[PDB]
Design a protein around this ligand. Structure first.
Ligand SMILES: *[C@@H]1O[C@H](CO)[C@@H](O[C@@H]2O[C@H](CO)[C@@H](O)[C@H](O)[C@H]2NC(C)=O)[C@H](O)[C@H]1NC(C)=O
Ligand SMILES: *[C@@H]1O[C@H](CO)[C@@H](O[C@@H]2O[C@H](CO)[C@@H](O)[C@H](O)[C@H]2NC(C)=O)[C@H](O)[C@H]1NC(C)=O
Lengths: 411, 411
């Protein structure tokens, strides 16, 4: 490990971690410096898997994952106190939170040119992974898992196809949380999700059926009927610009209904904590770097999307038969709704189709509870988390942890 | 008012109510004695509306409504303490909770014959209402509202048609919470609700489409295709006997997943409180009467359902143009799902169709929030409560209270 990157005293913690943690920079492609934060397994790190975590956007910080989703400690609303997370994914894994691509959070490049695309982010992320294993050569042999959320539905399978060609990397699987797998399948599934969750009436529904659909099949993705393109625009206003939280339909919109920062979300606690000078010092962040934001508007603004489907990435990964893949969706998210990703996994037409069943979690008091539904194929599973939104570990941490543990243990 | 029915000191309250409340018996048909609990408006009772409340079952106690939904005080988990309810419907109304029909809770008959049907429950409820106005003649002139939940979707429109013929009763409207309006529309809507809430996969969905449906229209109600009747049976196992809370999909099943008392619900607090001898004395319950249960299995067991649709009751009530009607559904209930009741109200084909829009509530902190969706016709509105289950006021009390206030004020 690089001893100069080790965090010794993290502001806002009342007890010192039982585990070693590092903050520094992985070399991406060209002049890119990707800020990492590595937290070793609370149990047997030497042999616990290494787990890459990517948040999406594009241009959103993986440190959101650490401080608000499944990190070893979570920022409190004061933006000062960190509290230990009993459901931390680092209970059983060495977790690498990577700010990616360049310009996101504390990540930067010397040429300070932050315009990028899916193929370049994969290649840079791949080079940062190689840099990680040069700094942490004691972790080269551990099981590697590539994981992430939302746009990491593109980041992770594109990165995975690069990693499966480097035999020095012990790739065992990938997991994508509420992931963008297929624009078409997302967009089509979202319209159904809207109607059957009571957001649209029969007036607008009956009309979409008539002008967007035929022979039992609907096109809400690239459909060109005038009335169809008109109906779908009211659907976007209702879902996206009416004051519903797109990340969790049953959650309030933070800041209330309107009469980078994601809509209906409050990033103040994390921003307050990470912009503290002493927090930056503890995290070994160069003093010259601009303020930490959750999402970089400019990376988002100048980003160029290349892939519309991950069908070929997944079938490449599945054709090797070496890797276990999990796509997991909170079933009350509307940004990357569960049905779109379930359609996606089904449309891969894989073998060993093992029947859709409920999966269970024991809650300390309430006992065994349905945590969601699972569908297992050969080397790929689709899974819902019942009552979780876009940030599954934030909404349902025990279900998120149970899912993660079972995925790692291939059981 | 009958002074001998007034409750003076209710066990488990730390402060005495600002309002008068009564517990005694309304004469139903024949030898039926229906136990009532009347709570006068906390504000200007003399002029506040009179509001009948019925819980459903059949055979479930309206005292569930008082002590766990929208009463002036709510039982705590100790089953001893009552705590004042800041969202009590009795803030602005004289609320009559009626245990109905005979044998439910503290209700009884001398002949002790508890087998009944929809037409007899209406007639008996109608006679109890007449008895109420003989005991409370000072409330004859106040605006009367008929309200209830679940099977009261049948109780209330059947009772309403009897009440609209007695000119001595000042009927202004009715409101039905998560109500059974049409078996067909419930059953058909529930199957869609199941699939689009991620409870069924494409295997079972694709099959239902093929064997239960045609020309864009599905029959999940009375359909006879062998495969259809087979698919619908897996749907009932998943929805009803897998460990999902049928009353609130996103809530845990009380008692955990299985490997009268409703499934996945814990009635202990209310039962503990109402079975206390001193509580019975305060509530003027005859010592001879058997124990209080939330739901009477036997009334349920011997009950005979007569109506399959309330279409004719509602069109009778609407044809007068004298009454305002509200059907309100928690949109995560599966026992009487919102879509079935929205289809129902739409299929009444009324006039003044006023466009489906979100409705708002101001939460003290979080500010203005979408509380659900509303569709206003002439004299009838359909309304969802976003994230509420079967017991709307239990899950979303401020949204329940706001809805109620606006319904009463005809605004
Ligand atoms: C967004 O989050 C911030 C930080 O959690 C909230 O600010 C806090 O408000 C509480 C309530 O009074 C205070 O006790 C804290 O001291 C505040 N924290 C800070 C660092 O100022 C803020 O209210 C939230 N805003 C919205 C609209 O949800
Ligand atoms: C059902 O509700 C009852 C009553 O609320 C629960 O019993 C209580 O459990 C808590 C937790 O220890 C105790 O503090 C209370 O004293 C208990 N109340 C009574 C009156 O015994 C019970 O646990 C619930 N059961 C389930 C499965 O949800």
């Amino acid at each position: 490990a690089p001893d100069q990157d080790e965090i010794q005293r993290l502001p806002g913690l009342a007890k010192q971690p039982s585990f070693r943690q590092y903050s520094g920079y992985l070399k991406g492609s060209g002049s890119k410096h990707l800020h990492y934060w590595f937290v070793e397994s609370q149990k047997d790190p030497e042999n616990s898997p290494v787990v890459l975590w990517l948040n999406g956007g594009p241009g959103c910080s993986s440190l959101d994952g650490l401080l608000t989703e499944h990190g070893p400690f979570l920022v409190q609303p004061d933006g000062v106190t960190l509290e230990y997370n009993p459901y931390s994914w680092n209970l059983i894994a060495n977790v690498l939170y990577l700010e990616s691509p360049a310009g996101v959070g504390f990540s930067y490049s010397d040429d300070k040119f932050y315009a990028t695309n899916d193929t370049e982010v994969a290649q840079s992320n791949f080079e940062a992974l190689q840099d990680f294993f040069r700094l942490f050569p004691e972790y080269k042999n551990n099981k590697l898992f590539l994981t992430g959320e939302s746009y990491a539905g593109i980041y992770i399978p594109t990165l995975a196809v690069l990693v499966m060609q480097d035999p020095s990397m012990n790739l065992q699987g990938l997991a994508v949380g509420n992931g963008l797998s297929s624009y078409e399948q997302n967009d089509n599934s979202l319209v159904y999700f809207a109607y059957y969750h009571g957001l649209l009436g029969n007036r607008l529904w009956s009309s979409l059926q008539t002008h967007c659909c035929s022979q039992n099949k609907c096109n809400f993705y690239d459909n060109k009927d005038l009335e169809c393109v008109t109906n779908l625009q009211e659907v976007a206003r209702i879902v996206g610009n009416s004051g519903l939280n797109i990340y969790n339909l049953y959650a309030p919109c933070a800041g209330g209904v309107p009469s980078m920062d994601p809509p209906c979300t409050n990033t103040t606690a994390a921003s307050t904590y990470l912009n503290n000078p002493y927090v930056r010092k503890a995290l070994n962040i160069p003093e010259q770097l601009p303020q930490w934001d959750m999402c970089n508007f400019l990376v988002n603004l100048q980003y160029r999307r290349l892939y519309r489907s991950m069908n070929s990435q997944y079938l490449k990964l599945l054709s090797s038969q070496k890797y276990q893949i999990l796509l997991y969706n909170g079933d009350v998210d509307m940004a990357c709704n569960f049905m779109g990703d379930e359609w996606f996994v089904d449309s891969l037409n894989q073998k060993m189709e093992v029947q859709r069943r409920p999966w269970l979690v024991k809650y300390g008091d309430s006992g065994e509870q349905i945590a969601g539904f699972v569908k297992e194929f050969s080397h790929i599973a689709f899974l819902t988390i019942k009552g979780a939104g876009h940030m599954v570990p934030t909404d349902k941490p025990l279900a998120a942890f149970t899912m993660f543990s079972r995925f790692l243990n291939k059981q």
